[PDB]
Amino acid sequence: QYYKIDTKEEILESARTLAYDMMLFYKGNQSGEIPGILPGPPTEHKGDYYWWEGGAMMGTYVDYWHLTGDPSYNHVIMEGMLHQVGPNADYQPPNHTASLGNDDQGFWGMSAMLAAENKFPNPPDDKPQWLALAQAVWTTQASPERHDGTCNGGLRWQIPPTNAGYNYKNTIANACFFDLGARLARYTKNNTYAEWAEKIFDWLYAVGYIDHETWAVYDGGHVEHNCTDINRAQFSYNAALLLHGAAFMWNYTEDQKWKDRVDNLLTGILRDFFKDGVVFEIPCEGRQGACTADMLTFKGYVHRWMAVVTQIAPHTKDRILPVLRTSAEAAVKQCVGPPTGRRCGFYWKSGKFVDPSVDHTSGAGEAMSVLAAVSSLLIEYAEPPATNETGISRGDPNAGMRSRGAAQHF
């Protein structure tokens, strides 16, 4: 094994080297390149990765600085986050319409929310501020044309009605909107965010994407079947994101129903995704060559989001932290690949390095996931998410409401 994680100082050093190796994939700060994106998209044969994964990377580094105190990459991350905001400061840049799902926009909004929660340095005064960007994403996702009567509500996966997949009302789109609403409620103390989060969670429960008996979290269903054709694939990020949002709602509301939802979602996650203490991407990891570029990132979110749950729902700490520890130990045990002696693969539970080429990418998602898992071992030393009591960001009461906003020509 190359990386050591047995003391705070060892973890910090390992995380620093992991942050270096992940950054080698990113070219957006170099002359002639586009800030905020990993190489791609694959539809243009420019690389393996889609736009939303750039937003996931940005948030990973906002958390990296929060967890380690190392600000080395903060300027690069601010540049990337600001470049992708779009003309209406809502994470809907039109050049990316083909990638404009509610999930894709949501991941960028969640990185902005994280920047506000983590007191990440503010953009210049003339540029959109982190809380305002999160508010803009949430507001566009709450807009009435995104909430029709099919399946008695819920967001569709896609934003443009002509995009393939507009007929799929899926967990991830709704989970992003739910999580943002819960987090905006806690930060701002505005109850309209919370009422929307409650409504969307109740919809996810009613439609049966949350199993009423087992608290498994399924993938979605299609409007032409009234959402009854449930795709029962269980992706780790879906259950983990609902757990994260539920923990914010428990912290904000102190309503026992939210504590019960945290506990039930957590029981399900530990049962389904942790195998002898190691996170496992059940729909695809059982054999090599099946996980997509997107899926290689999910286990990193699981680690980072579950670590935050222990801060805002502290009664969960002893159920979560020991399991994140065994999972991160498995992550580092397999970061031994050539040519560096420390290259990271995906198949942590297996105990062996597998070249990312088996899954047809250069390996950025695997690197991101290990960075997330190792950094998050420092959660016990980190501050909890800030609210507006101590945060430094600024909001915008008209976030998402510009006259040139896309909702005005839907």
Ligand X SMILES: OC[C@H]1O[C@H](O)[C@@H](O)[C@@H](O)[C@@H]1O
Task: Please enumerate, by residue number, every residue annotated as part of a binding site for Ca(2+).
Answer: 48, 104, 360
Q: How far apart are CA 164 and CA 237, in angstroms?
A: 22
Strand partners, 217: 210
Residue number, 220 or 385, with CB nearest to ligand X: 220
Query: Going by C-beta distance under 8 Å and a sequence separation of 6 or more, which residues neighbour residue 338?
Result: none
Q: The tokens 């400061």 sit on which residue? A: 89
Residue number, 159 or 194, with CB nearest to Ca ion: 159
Residue number, 36 or 101, with CB nearest to Ca ion: 101
Count of residues that interact with Ca ion, criterion CB under 5 A:
5
Residue number, 41 or 405, with CB nearest to ligand X: 41
Residue number, 266 or 293, with CB nearest to ligand X: 293
Q: How far apart are CA 277 and CA 275, in angstroms?
A: 5
Question: Given its phi and psi angles, is residue 226 left (phi above 0), alpha (psi -120 to 50 degrees) or beta?
Answer: left
Would you count residue 46 as binding Ca ion (CB under 5 A)?
no
Would you count residue 235 as binding ligand X (CB under 6 A)?
yes
| Closest CB 284 distance from ligand X, rounded Å | 9
**Tokens coding 164:** 């393939």
Query: CA geometry: angle at 205 spanning 272 and 292, to 5°?
Result: 45
Q: The tokens 């062996």 sit on which residue? A: 352
Residue number, 157 or 305, with CB nearest to Ca ion: 157
Question: If you compute the radius of gyration of the chain from its CA atoms, what whole number of angstroms results?
Answer: 20
Q: How far apart are CA 116 and CA 130, in angstroms?
A: 6
| Closest CB 79 distance from Ca ion, rounded Å | 23
From the list 103-111, 114-122, 176-184, 204-212, the region that binds Ca ion by CB under 5 A is 103-111
CB count in 10 Å sphere of residue 178: 30
First-to-last alpha carbon distance for the chain, in angstroms, is: 54
Would you count residue 272 as binding ligand X (CB under 6 A)?
no
| Closest CB 357 distance from ligand X, rounded Å | 20
| Closest CB 151 distance from ligand X, rounded Å | 15
C-alpha distances out from residue 355 to 221, 285, 303, 342, Å = 34, 14, 22, 12
| Closest CB 170 distance from ligand X, rounded Å | 4
Among 85, 100, 137, 295, binds ligand X (CB under 6 A): 295
Residue number, 79 or 211, with CB nearest to ligand X: 211
Query: Going by C-beta distance under 8 Å and a sequence separation of 6 or more, which residues neighbour residue 314?
Result: none
Query: Going by C-beta distance under 8 Å and a sequence separation of 6 or more, which residues neighbour residue 323?
Result: 270, 274, 277
Residue number, 236 or 376, with CB nearest to ligand X: 236
Among 13, 79, 219, 272, binds ligand X (CB under 6 A): 219
Would you count residue 220 as binding ligand X (CB under 6 A)?
yes
Among 53, 63, 104, 329, binds Ca ion (CB under 5 A): 104
Binding site: residue ranges? 48, 104, 360
Residue 295 contact among ligand X, Ca ion, none, beta carbon within 5 to 8 Å by kind: ligand X
Residue 326 contact among ligand X, Ca ion, none, beta carbon within 5 to 8 Å by kind: none
Q: How far apart are CA 108 and CA 81, in angstroms?
A: 8
Among 212, 271, 315, 360, binds Ca ion (CB under 5 A): 360
14, 332 contact by CB (below 8 A): yes
401 burial via Cβ count (<10 Å: 0-12, 13-18, 19+)? middle
Q: How far apart are CA 278 and CA 270, in angstroms?
A: 10
Among 101, 154, 268, 400, binds Ca ion (CB under 5 A): 101
CB count in 10 Å sphere of residue 27: 16
Residue 172 contact among ligand X, Ca ion, none, beta carbon within 5 to 8 Å by kind: ligand X
From the list 15-23, 48-56, 204-212, 291-299, the region that binds ligand X by CB under 6 A is 291-299
Would you count residue 294 as binding ligand X (CB under 6 A)?
yes
Among 84, 99, 170, 251, binds ligand X (CB under 6 A): 170
**Tokens coding 387:** 């609210």
Residue 104 contact among Ca ion, ligand X, none, beta carbon within 5 to 8 Å by kind: Ca ion
Among 100, 113, 131, 172, binds ligand X (CB under 6 A): 172
329, 348 contact by CB (below 8 A): no
Q: Which residues bind ligand X (CB under 6 A)?
A: 170, 172, 219-220, 235, 292, 294-295
Q: Which residues bind Ca ion (CB under 5 A)?
A: 48, 99, 101, 104, 360
